Structure 1
Amino acid sequence: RTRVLILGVNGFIGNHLTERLLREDHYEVYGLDIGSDAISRFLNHPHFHFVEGDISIHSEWIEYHVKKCDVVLPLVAIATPIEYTRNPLRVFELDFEENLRIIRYCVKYRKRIIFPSTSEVYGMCSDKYFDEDHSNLIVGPVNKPRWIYSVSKQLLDRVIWAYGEKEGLQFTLFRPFNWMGPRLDNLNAARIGSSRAITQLILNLVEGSPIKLIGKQKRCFTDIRDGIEALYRIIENAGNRCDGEIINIGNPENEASIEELGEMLLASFEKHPLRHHFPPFAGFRVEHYKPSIRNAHRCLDWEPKIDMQETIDETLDFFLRTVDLT
């Protein structure tokens, strides 16, 4: 069966992607990380193999699994805004330099690489719907440090594209738009996956802190149920329709501003069985951004199905029931 190397498996995507692949009968999953607390349910599974490791520290050990496997999924990256501006150099070394090494192992051993790009690469693009193949990418002056993340991920994309063009690297790039659902990534985990904005809000509701509002700008959210299904089809690569493709993965109908998202969580929150176990709501303390999903349609015959309310209730519910009250 197909050997899937998941680098940074101890989190949101690794958990859902693993559960999925394992439901099928033709995948062998090699999940590499420094801890397994988040995928313990899979440790004793016959087709799962935890691999002790760290992409900043290990060189050889990782190169070896790239060669030993068929498809590689690099999920390790610092994807926390405050950090873009706080420890930018560390964000560049991990996100850019260390992943570049993995990309290179992939071209060297002729392996398929499914790389998580970012929805942030579009920047201040005026298109109502961001198009992987046509939208221009707009960022601010170099003196506006917040963009180092976006531009870094973008340069990587370009380098992957270059290897695909001049050296036969087989690949697929995916750009997830605010994925959410059960088993969210810890706010400070350097693993790509779950929307930090919504997990910060749930955190607010859980800790009794207020929801801070810049809350104007609107965003698209995607249920992990719909998102992981898409990712899974990219691994399937039916008819190889994904080779050389860049695919946005989001539900363009779930639009909502920070304040609207918050309002939605509050509602589901106030009606939740465990509501009494959480502090009273602290209150609210004072452009476009939609993805085009044509490529997803084309390459995957994919279309988001879960209704937004359903996603809101479930993500919150699972979170509340998982909270360690003691």
Structure 2
Amino acid sequence: RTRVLILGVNGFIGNHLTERLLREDHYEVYGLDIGSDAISRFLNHPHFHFVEGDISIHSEWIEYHVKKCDVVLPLVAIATPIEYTRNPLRVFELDFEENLRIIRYCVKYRKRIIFPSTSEVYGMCSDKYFDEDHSNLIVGPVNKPRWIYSVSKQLLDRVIWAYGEKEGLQFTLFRPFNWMGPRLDNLNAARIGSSRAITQLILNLVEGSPIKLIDGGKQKRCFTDIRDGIEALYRIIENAGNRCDGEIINIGNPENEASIEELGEMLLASFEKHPLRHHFPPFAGFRVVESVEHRKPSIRNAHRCLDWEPKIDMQETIDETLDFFLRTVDLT
């Protein structure tokens, strides 16, 4: 069976991908992380193996696991916005330098790498649909430090692409678009995965704080149920016909489009109708604030390389993501 190395398995994607893979009879999962509290249901599984580790501290121990496995998924990265501008140097050292080392182990030992690129790479692209192979990437002047995440991730994409072109590195880059569902990452975890926007809003509902609508919260985003998203990631790992080699694939539901405000309204609605509503504070309201206006993915590549099409509809995802969160909250 195929050996899958998941670096930063202790979170959203790690839990869902591992459930998916273990469901099949031809996979062996090596989940590396500094903790296992989020994938404990898998510790005793015969085909799951927890590997103690940290990509900033371990060099040799990670290199060893790259050589031991067949496919590598590097999920460790700082994705939260305020961090780009608060601790930009740390976001660069971890997301760029440390992941670059793992990329190089993959080319050194000739392993397949499935890398999480980001939807922010498109930046202020004007296309109505962001195309992995045709859209231009647009970012602000360097005096707009918020773009450092986007550009860092973009350079990494290009470096992987160069290794693919000149040194036979086998890879597939994937770009998630607001994945959401049960077991969301903590807002400050350095693990790529769950939509931070929806988990912040749910936190708002849970803690009784207001839902900040920056400049009217008019900017639109696309949301994807993790059941759809993880199914596509699974098929990338399958790589039927090897159709994912050298490809860059957006993984999102372009039909689930909503502005921050509309999403806020949708959660509020499912929240008030929820059975455990009474265990949470009263809604504090929408607080306008003012210190990317479109982000719709093209999914032709996913259609083509994966025969994938998102099946769950907006309401089902909202409902289940909220439901699971409320019922998992420790009221004490």
Work out whether the TM-score is over 0.5. yes
Q: C-alpha distance in 2, partners of 1:287/1:119?
A: 13
Query: Does residue 246 in structure 1 map to residue 252 in structure 2?
Result: no
Residue 309 (structure 2) aligns with: 303
Deviations 1:27-86 (A, max 9, x none): 000000000000000000000000000000000000000000000000000000000000
Larger displacement relative to structure 2 (130-139 or 282-291): 282-291
Q: In the TM superposition, what is the alpha-carbon distance from 1:24 to its structure 2 partner?
A: 0.3
User: 1:84 & 1:256 partners in 2: Cα distance?
Assistant: 25
Inter-partner Cα distance in structure 2 for 1:257 and 1:44: 42
**Scaled by the length of structure 2, what TM-score is found?**
0.98
- Deviation at residue 270 of structure 1 after TM alignment: 0.3
State the shift of 1:129 in Å: 0.1
Counterpart of 2:185 in 1: which secondary structure? coil
- Aligned match of 1:95: 95
Cα displacement (A) at 1:87: 0.2
- SS of 1:173's equivalent? strand
The residue that corresponds to 2:175 in the other structure is 175
Give, in whole Å, the separation in 2 of the partners of 1:92 and 1:85: 11
In the TM superposition, 1:275-294 aligns within 5 A as: 275-285=277-287, 287-294=293-300
Following the alignment from structure 2 to structure 1, what is the Cα–Cα distance between the partners of residues 331 and 273? 19
How far off its partner does 1:122 sit?
0.1
Distance 1:109 1:299 in 2: 25
Q: Deviations over 1:202-255 (max 9, x none)?
A: 000000000001111000000000000000000000000000000000000000
* Aligned-pair CA distance for 1:93: 0.1
**SS, match of residue 313 in structure 1:** helix
SS in 2 for 1:130: coil
Aligned length: 326
- Residue by residue over 1:161-182, the C-alpha shift from the partner in whole angstroms, topping out at 9 and shown as x without a partner, is 0000000000000000000000
> How far apart are the structure 2 equivalents of 1:41 and 1:322?
15
More moved, 283-292 vs 173-182: 283-292
1:324 correspondence with 2:324: no
Question: What secondary structure, in the 3-state scheme, does the structure 2 residue paired with 1:91 have?
Answer: helix
Give 1:197 shift.
Answer: 0.3
Secondary structure at 2:151's aligned position in 1?
helix
Separation in 2 of the partners of 1:288 and 1:241?
Answer: 29
In 2: Cα distance, 1:216 partner to 1:302 partner: 30
Measure, in 2, the Cα distance between the counterparts of 1:216 and 1:290: 15
The 4+ residue runs of structure 1 with deviation greater than 6 A are none
C-alpha displacement of 1:141: 0.1
Deviation at 1:188, TM superposition (A): 0.1
For 1:150-197, what per-residue CA distance to the aligned partner results, in whole angstroms no more than 9, with x for missing partners? 000000000000000000000000000000000000000000000000
CA deviations on 1:130-157 (whole Å, 9 max, x unpaired) are 0000000000000000000000000000
In structure 2, C-alpha distance between the alignment counterparts of 1:24 and 1:271, rounded to whole Å: 37
Deviation at 1:301, TM superposition (A): 0.1
Residue matched to 2:152: 152
SS of the aligned residue for 1:76 comes to: coil
Please state whether the residue corresponding to 2:95 is helix, strand or coil: helix
Could you state the TM-score of these two structures normalised by the residue count of structure 1? 1.00
What CA RMSD, in Å, does the superposition of the two structures yield over aligned residues?
A: 1.0
CA distance in 2, matches of 1:15, 1:317: 18
Secondary structure in 1 aligned to 2:21? helix
Mapped partners of 1:209, 1:25: distance in 2 = 46
SS in 1 for 2:182: coil
Deviation sequence 1:250-290 (CA, Å, 0-9, x none):
00000000000000000000000000000000000092210
Q: Which residue of 2 aligns with 1:217?
A: 219
Q: Secondary structure at the match of 2:38?
A: helix
Give the distance between the partners of 1:93 and 1:75, measured in 2 at CA. 15
In the TM superposition, 1:130-149 aligns within 5 A as: 130-149=130-149
CA distance in 2, matches of 1:288, 1:186: 26
Q: Which runs of 5+ in 1 are unaligned?
A: none
Supply the distance in 2 between the matched residues of 1:233 and 1:191 (Cα, whole angstroms). Answer: 21
